[PDB]
Structure formats: structure tokens, C-alpha cells
A paper describes a structure:
Here, we report a structural and thermodynamic analysis of six extensively simplified [name] variants, where 19–24 of its 58 residues are alanines, using differential scanning calorimetry (DSC) and X-ray crystallography. However, the alanine substitutions exerted a small unexpected enthalpy stabilization, and the magnitude of which increased in a nearly additive fashion along with the number of alanine substitutions, which was, however, over-compensated with entropy destabilization.
We mutated the exposed and partially exposed residues (P8, K15, R17, R39, K41, R42, and D50) to alanines because we expected that these substitutions would minimally affect the densely packed interior of the native protein45. The mutants were named according to the numbers of alanines in their sequences (i.e. [name]-19A stands for a [name] variant containing 19 Alanines) and a suffix ‘a’ or ‘b’ was added to distinguish variants containing the same numbers of alanines at different sites45. To provide a structural view of this peculiar instance of enthalpy stabilization, we crystallized and solved the structures of six simplified [name] variants containing 19, 20, 21, 22, 23, and 24 alanines. On the other hand, despite repeated trials, [name] variants containing 25–27 alanines merely formed needle crystals, unsuitable for diffraction. All six variants crystallized under the same conditions, indicating a minimal disturbance of the surface properties, even upon multiple alanine substitutions. The new water molecules were recruited around the alanine substitution sites and were involved in novel hydration networks. Thus, favorable protein–water interactions appear to be the most likely factor responsible for the increased unfolding enthalpy of the simplified [name], rather than the relaxation of atomic clashes or the creation of new intramolecular hydrogen bonds or van der Waals contacts, assuming that the hydration structures remain the same for all alanine mutants in their denatured states. Finally, it is noteworthy that a protein in which more than 40% of the residues are alanines can fold into a native-like, well packed structure that can be crystallized and solved at high resolution.
Residue numbers in the entry: 1001 to 1056
The structure:
């Protein structure tokens, strides 16, 4: 499992309210989070499926 899959989700400083997915390693699950539209980190995916494919 890539190390970035352990990062906490990062909304960043933007003002958009975009639904994105992160891998929650403790939950063994991809979960939705709000991304502000800038300054993304790597644990940040378009869908649950893309999160799981990278990290599960």
C-alpha cells in the first residue's frame, strides 16, 4: 500500500466545495471528503473506485 494512502484528507485553502474521495486506512474504506479546489495532496481521488484501486 503506498505510504500516501495513510495521509489524512486535506481540504486545502480553497473556497470550492468539491466532493472527492480519500482512502481511510483505519476504516479499510474509501470515504468522501470536501476538497476546496486547490492545493490537493495525493490521498485525493475522483471516486471511491479510484481510491481503492490505488490504496486497497
Amino acid at each position: 500500500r503506498p505510504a500516501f494512502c495513510l495521509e489524512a484528507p486535506y481540504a486545502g485553502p480553497g473556497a470550492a466545495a468539491i466532493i472527492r474521495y480519500f482512502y481511510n486506512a483505519a476504516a479499510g474504506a474509501a470515504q468522501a471528503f470536501v476538497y476546496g479546489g486547490v492545493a490537493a495532496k495525493r490521498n485525493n481521488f475522483a471516486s471511491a473506485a479510484a481510491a481503492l484501486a490505488a490504496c486497497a
